């Protein structure tokens, strides 16, 4: 019974195969059939290619030896190689053209999700070309989805030598009969088969996956659309910056490129961006997913005024200063969305671009107290319940699992009224003691938030809602300004508090505003519709932020 | 008696002044004298420029209002503005041409070093131009050297209004007579003078600094060359990555751009790079200054084999994988220099470029045991003393302050023999109990290393020297390779262990190798000759790593 799946790289996890390009080059240059593939494998185990695949030499040392084999082969075939014949060029192009075979990777992901130990076993080289970063990136994206990456040039062994298979079995801690092995080269399959492993000769992906699903008994083909890659907290780079003597800010960091600062809402975490962090880093950005003040590993001072917009924005500026960042793109959701519009209004020079999920930008009304304005809309009643220090802390902190299980639900799963919260005397008075687990979250994701909130609880988070008068006075100073830097507003159809229609007058203050819209999406945007969120953000980033 | 110094930005900390460009533009376009400066200040306190300087409007809202004032002014002066007259262009160029007035900044640094509270007081705007990042960077570099940055557009007050001066005095917690105030605008000096502050009208920097030194009694002019900016550990962004279940790696992070991974030697810290971190971030790089395995906040497992080159390099690859970095430039010193050459030999695809300080790259001799090779050179005797577990730990851990004070000395300060260390039975047998403080370090820098080494001591650090046979066997696999990626070798004239002549055959294995050389430099390269190190690295980075 199978418990491990092994994949080749070239022609299996990555397409098109480099060997395929040698043939394509022969045809394009009208060279004798197999001349290049013959020069490539020249000398077999004693040849230049074996030495390269074993790690004896690097790719740049191999290029001249391949040139010589190509000359020798053409001499024997009584033919001439063209004037501008360059092996470097042929390989540079082939390596660059090679992309991840998404359905193969998707099938590997599914097997690992169902308990399989997965591995990549590849005959590869030590790449020292000026353009090696493209291959480095490919391997990076691919390798993180597997338990093991076994590279011929790193182990000093090569397929089809029997020892690399014995090494593989030892790495997997598995007996041959427990292993499925997938290769596009029949000769490299032969030793695994001889050892007793299940083998699949990969020609077209679809037939390979039909074979793979028949042998594992797990559906790999015609599967529903998979969720984006998420984050395992213990595998992340965690960062800490002191912004002032008693305030430290925590963030999770992933990727290289322009800095993208992610700002969560209430009562959330850096983890609310779990589905965006890998996707945004893969799109070519340096992601900084914050634990906002009062949350997670960030400090939680008890004073209400430590949570007004002016102080929070000043701290985020200091955060940039301490990291040596002149700018960041600011993406926010809910309370993070509010802060992000204020960063754009007060510090435009420090904000590369600004994006908000659900949170509209509505200028302050100087002719009306903010407390009057909140009373005008019944959906904002929960905010008045959040006013009195201690009351909402008591209900929210009583049972953490019940809190997050009641809150983090989709539009078709609500257990929460909201409206007449004050009258009913609580957010959870008509909610069950043991809510069912929402389709958006697993038990373990709820427990990550539970553990996070055990440190400081809900005082610091609730204080974000306790600065209406302070926020309003500060916001009134910005009344003559417009937001003229790149800006994106993303509305969610089924958010009943931050409704799409509330954002309708935004173009008056943000003339060049760009928009996104997510259908059948509730308040918890990132986890409700991750794929859609990722598509809207990546497209807006590549077009407007670099 | 003075204790605070206040500087204007435009025409004082930054040159040339923007007002100066308005005049230069009038002359270039043969416009009436003062036409632009008149349109700029039009309406005085009621005008567009005051509203901008107060924060009522952003720079982009101000551009059209300036265009109108320019049209109105030309109409009155019975003149016409040229066909391609654009305020945006004039200001974009002026802002971009404006650089830090280095001797003014240097004088501000000296006053702060002698106990003064320093501040920048400026009439500035909220910059939302597409090219705002240039100004953002200027302010970032400048602001970090001062206690306070007071910006007119942020306080809603402007020079010469008396309230901004009262705000300044309150920010400084100083009485007027304790303040020197420097401005290039006589009108903006007048209220500070009226309050009783010492004022200096800045025309040419030199006369301003003569006035400033006469009034403070501190030498600011004709001063010796200042050391580069250093790091205050508590003001840095600290990062932590788990590379394996019991191994966590700590790093300090600063800047944006290509990732530059700094690898210290024995028995050092991320702090050994204190003079390089600010300089490298300012040059446009994202710096990752490591605490290598066994040091500082990084894990220190006790097993010798956890410190062989193979394991250390694999961990650094995982470090890159966990941060989402396909590559980094690897710069190392001493043991870090050795690791960095091995990263280039085994993982060329993950190494953008490689640089070593002092540490040469010498291929392993397969016909000689490494223990024989170390015995051949008398300068390597201390390495044999480091072999027996516990002996060197005992002497090095006995008195931490004495350890670092004896070790971290310049070429003309040695208290350490080295050679016949085993025979003498210790590194410090002929060294004082209370060494004098070396010219390279302050008391406080020694105490930072003392506190760092209190956590794990010297076992983990010493274990780097305890894998000769393991390292040699692994290195022998690389014997057929060459280093063909961008590489820099920096030799130090007075390093008596890692002597410049030891690097003489490097071009045989690294044909495209670039070199740097530092005269009158001992083993502790970074702190011995920071300025020279920074110049060699920045120049090599901008030319070879991007
Ligand atoms: C139908 C309830 C789902 C929901 N929750 C919120 C919410 C909850 C708690 C805090 N902030 C916002 C907002 N809008 C919503 O539709
Ligand atoms: C004259 C002594 C200065 C010195 N120290 C070392 C050294 C000390 C401790 C550890 N590793 C290296 C090397 N070369 C040197 O000139």
């Amino acid at each position: 019974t199978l418990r491990a799946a092994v994949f080749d790289l070239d022609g299996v996890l990555a397409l098109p195969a480099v060997f395929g390009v040698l043939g394509r080059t022969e045809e394009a240059l009208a060279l004798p059939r197999g001349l290049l593939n013959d020069a490539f494998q020249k000398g077999g185990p004693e040849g230049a290619t074996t030495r390269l695949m074993k790690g004896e030499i690097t790719l740049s040392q191999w290029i001249p030896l391949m040139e010589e084999n190509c000359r020798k082969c053409s001499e024997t075939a009584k033919v001439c190689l063209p004037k501008n014949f360059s092996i470097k060029e042929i390989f540079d192009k082939a390596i660059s053209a090679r992309k991840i075979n998404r359905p193969m990777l998707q099938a590997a992901l599914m097997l690992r999700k169902k308990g399989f130990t997965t591995a990549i076993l590849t005959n590869t080289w030590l790449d020292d070309r000026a353009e090696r970063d493209g291959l480095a990136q490919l391997m990076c994206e691919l390798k993180m989805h597997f338990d093991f990456l076994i590279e011929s040039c790193q182990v000093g062994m090569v397929k089809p030598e029997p020892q690399i298979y014995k090494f593989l079995l030892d790495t997997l801690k598995a007996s041959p009969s427990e292993v499925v092995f997938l290769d596009d080269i029949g000769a490299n399959l032969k030793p695994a088969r001889d050892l007793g492993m299940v083998t699949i000769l990969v020609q077209d992906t679809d037939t390979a996956l039909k074979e793979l699903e028949k042998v594992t008994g797990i559906q790999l083909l015609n599967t529903p659309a998979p969720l984006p890659t998420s984050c395992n907290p213990s595998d992340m780079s965690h960062g800490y910056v002191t912004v002032k003597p008693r305030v430290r800010l925590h963030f999770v960091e992933l990727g290289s490129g322009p800095a993208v600062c992610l700002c969560h809402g209430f009562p959330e975490s850096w983890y609310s961006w779990r589905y965006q962090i890998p996707a945004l880093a893969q799109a070519g950005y340096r992601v900084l997913a914050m634990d906002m003040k009062g949350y997670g590993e960030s400090s939680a001072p008890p004073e209400i005024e430590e949570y007004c917009m002016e102080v929070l924005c000043k701290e985020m500026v200091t955060f940039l200063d301490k990291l040596g960042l002149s700018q960041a793109v600011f993406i926010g959701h809910d309370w993070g969305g509010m802060l992000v519009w204020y960063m754009a209004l007060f510090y435009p020079e420090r904000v590369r671009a600004v994006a908000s999920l659900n949170t509209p930008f509505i200028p302050a009304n100087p002719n009306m107290s903010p407390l009057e304005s909140i009373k005008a809309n019944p959906v904002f009643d929960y905010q008045l319940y959040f006013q009195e220090p201690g009351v909402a802390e008591a209900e929210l902190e009583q049972n953490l699992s019940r809190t997050f299980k009641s809150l983090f639900r989709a539009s078709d799963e609500s257990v929460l009224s909201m409206h007449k919260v004050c009258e009913a005397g609580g957010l959870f008075v008509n909610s069950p003691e043991e809510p069912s687990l929402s389709r958006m979250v697993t038990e373990e994701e709820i427990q990550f938030y539970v553990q996070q909130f055990k440190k400081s609880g809900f005082r610091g988070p609730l204080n974000w809602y306790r600065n209406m008068e302070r926020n309003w006075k500060w916001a009134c100073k910005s009344l003559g300004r417009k937001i003229l830097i790149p800006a994106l507003m993303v509305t969610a159809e089924k958010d009943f508090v931050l409704v799409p229609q509330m954002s309708q007058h935004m173009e008056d203050w943000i003339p060049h505003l760009k928009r996104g819209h997510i259908e059948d999406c509730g308040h918890w945007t990132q986890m409700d519709k991750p794929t859609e969120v990722n598509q809207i953000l990546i497209k807006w980033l590549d077009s407007d932020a670099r």
Side-chain angles (χ1 to χ4, degrees), chain A residues 248-261:
Chain A
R248 170 187 92 162
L249 297 179
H250 173 248
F251 63 105
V252 153
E253 196 167 32
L254 192 76
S256 56
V260 181
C261 184

Side-chain angles (χ1 to χ4, degrees), chain A residues 266 334 382 407 414 416 418 465 494-497 523-524:
Chain A
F266 171 93
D334 181 72
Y382 78 96
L407 285 167
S414 190
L416 251 44
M418 289 197 126
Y465 281 102
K494 289 165 194 194
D495 189 326
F496 306 124
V497 170
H523 180 70
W524 321 99

Side-chain angles (χ1 to χ4, degrees), chain A residues 166-234:
Chain A
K166 294 289 195 152
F167 182 85
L168 170 74
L169 287 177
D170 187 78
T171 304
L172 302 172
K173 307 187 176 169
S175 58
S177 90
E178 300 175 303
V179 179
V180 213
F181 182 105
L182 295 92
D183 208 307
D184 64 318
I185 299 178
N188 302 338
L189 222 45
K190 199 150 80 221
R193 186 263 297 143
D194 173 55
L195 233 32
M197 290 182 221
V198 175
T199 58
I200 292 154
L201 177 63
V202 177
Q203 279 181 30
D204 65 300
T205 302
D206 252 279
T207 316
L209 298 179
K210 282 163 213 152
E211 286 181 49
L212 179 58
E213 81 160 41
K214 198 116 174 172
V215 81
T216 59
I218 297 152
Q219 184 181 280
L220 303 168
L221 236 30
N222 315 319
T223 266
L227 285 175
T229 304
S230 180
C231 289
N232 178 191
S234 74

Side-chain angles (χ1 to χ4, degrees), chain A residues 265-268 333-335 358 379 382-383 386 406-411 413-418 427 465 494-499 521-524:
Chain A
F266 171 93
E268 303 182 67
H333 169 257
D334 181 72
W335 259 116
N358 309 39
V379 303
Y382 78 96
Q383 307 200 4
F386 288 177
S406 313
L407 285 167
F408 304 162
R409 317 197 63 84
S411 52
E413 298 178 321
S414 190
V415 301
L416 251 44
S417 263
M418 289 197 126
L427 257 315
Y465 281 102
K494 289 165 194 194
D495 189 326
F496 306 124
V497 170
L498 299 177
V499 313
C521 189
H523 180 70
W524 321 99

Side-chain angles (χ1 to χ4, degrees), chain A residues 17 64 77 103 109 176 213 431 457:
Chain A
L109 258 349
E213 81 160 41
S431 168

Side-chain angles (χ1 to χ4, degrees), chain A residues 50 53-56 151-158 161 163-164:
Chain A
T50 295
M53 298 306 199
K54 280 199 184 182
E56 305 180 17
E151 301 172 294
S152 78
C153 58
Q154 278 294 302
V155 297
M157 295 182 281
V158 92
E161 294 170 341
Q163 53 181 3
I164 198 152

